[PDB]
Amino acid sequence: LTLGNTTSSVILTNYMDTQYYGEIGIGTPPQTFKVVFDTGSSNVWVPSSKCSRLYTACVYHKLFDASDSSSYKHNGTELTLRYSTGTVSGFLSQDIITVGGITVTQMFGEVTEMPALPFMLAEFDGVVGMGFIEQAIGRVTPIFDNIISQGVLKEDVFSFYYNRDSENSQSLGGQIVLGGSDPQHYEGNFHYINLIKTGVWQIQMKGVSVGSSTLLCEDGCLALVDTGASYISGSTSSIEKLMEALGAKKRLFDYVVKCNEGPTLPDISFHLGGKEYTLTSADYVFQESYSSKKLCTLAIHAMDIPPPTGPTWALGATFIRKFYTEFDRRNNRIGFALAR
Ligand SMILES: Cc1ccc(F)cc1Oc1c(C(=O)N2CCNCC2)c2ccnc(Cc3ccccc3)c2n1-c1ccccc1
Ligand SMILES: Cc1ccc(F)cc1Oc1c(C(=O)N2CCNCC2)c2ccnc(Cc3ccccc3)c2n1-c1ccccc1
Ligand SMILES: *[C@@H]1O[C@H](CO)[C@@H](O)[C@H](O)[C@H]1NC(C)=O
Hints:
340 residues, Cathepsin D, subunit A, domain 1, 6-stranded mixed beta barrel, 6 helices, 24 strands, 11% helix, 42% strand, globular, binds the ligand Cc1ccc(F)cc1Oc1c(C(=O)N2CCNCC2)c2ccnc(Cc3ccccc3)c2n1-c1ccccc1, binds 2-acetamido-2-deoxy-beta-D-glucopyranose, hydrolase/hydrolase inhibitor, pepsin-like protease, glycosylation, HYDROLASE-HYDROLASE INHIBITOR complex, monomeric
């Protein structure tokens, strides 16, 4: 490890409190892409100009054209990336990537197969994996590992700030700091929780409290700190019990409560590293109305993550909005502080 004296920041756009994305430039001259920065994955990918136009997602998203780049280096190794909500398939390519003022030579996926669901619902074009090399498909060096190798960053850490609002604009949607943290977006001090294993941004959770009593995760469970996930997720059985306690009901892809009942829902506390991380109903209910005639969605869903990573809870944008998050690679730990 070689450390420098610089930090780099990536300004994020907040789309409806569900999507947080920044811009990256690829090639010479740069081709700009809207990307989600995901601690739950380790690969970089953008849709390719070689993606057949019968993939509707490829007609609607920005495509990388290797034939328009003078710094492109051919590879062609076939690559399939299987996520929680979808799969992308393509080939590996090498080019110069610009991330918040930093220029880095990177091997990335050129996506030729991009299904309509969920990609047509996506505001971002691609993904920048913030996970470890051990979980990278095709043993490709992740972008942060390649930035660290330059010897410019002050610390072997990166931090996430996700703002509220989304609806009104003018305000900063969010921010990623490479090589440090931004004291302007957090208050008090960081509390760290050590990783259960290197290779994955996952920590031990001691319990989940719904109101007064510790209803769930009695005798521990796992928690994935997932920046690319919109909500807080748990297994079907854990969520079924949590939602029964809240009076919520299953609706295809989400749970809903009567809008008027939203402000009466209890606090949900996550027991991580001896500290209690509390979300009130305003932090987990999308209060679109206070009407008894309308149904309001919850920012908590069921997601069955399979082994080796799962069964596991995922702490996404819903958690991050409340708690400014620092990802420490040098010490294999995650830090939380109250966001401001
Ligand atoms: C496909 C994908 C890759 C990387 C990434 F950062 C996010 C990704 O997309 C993912 C997830 C998801 O698959 N995750 C797995 C990897 N870590 C982040 C969550 C994912 C998990 C849970 N909920 C949503 C919300 C959702 C689910 C279905 C349809 C609409 C919205 C997810 N989305 C997503 C898809 C489209 C637009 C916005 C988000
Ligand atoms: C439009 C529609 C009508 C009847 C119906 F049975 C389903 C419908 O579609 C619905 C929803 C949905 O059920 N809605 C009803 C309540 N409010 C939102 C739309 C619905 C609710 C939340 N998220 C998605 C998006 C989504 C997509 C994939 C994975 C996760 C999430 C939804 N889709 C949907 C949209 C496009 C394609 C497929 C489904
Ligand atoms: C692709 O690049 C990587 C560099 O690590 C290597 O595994 C492989 O030999 C390359 N394949 C081609 C066809 O250039």
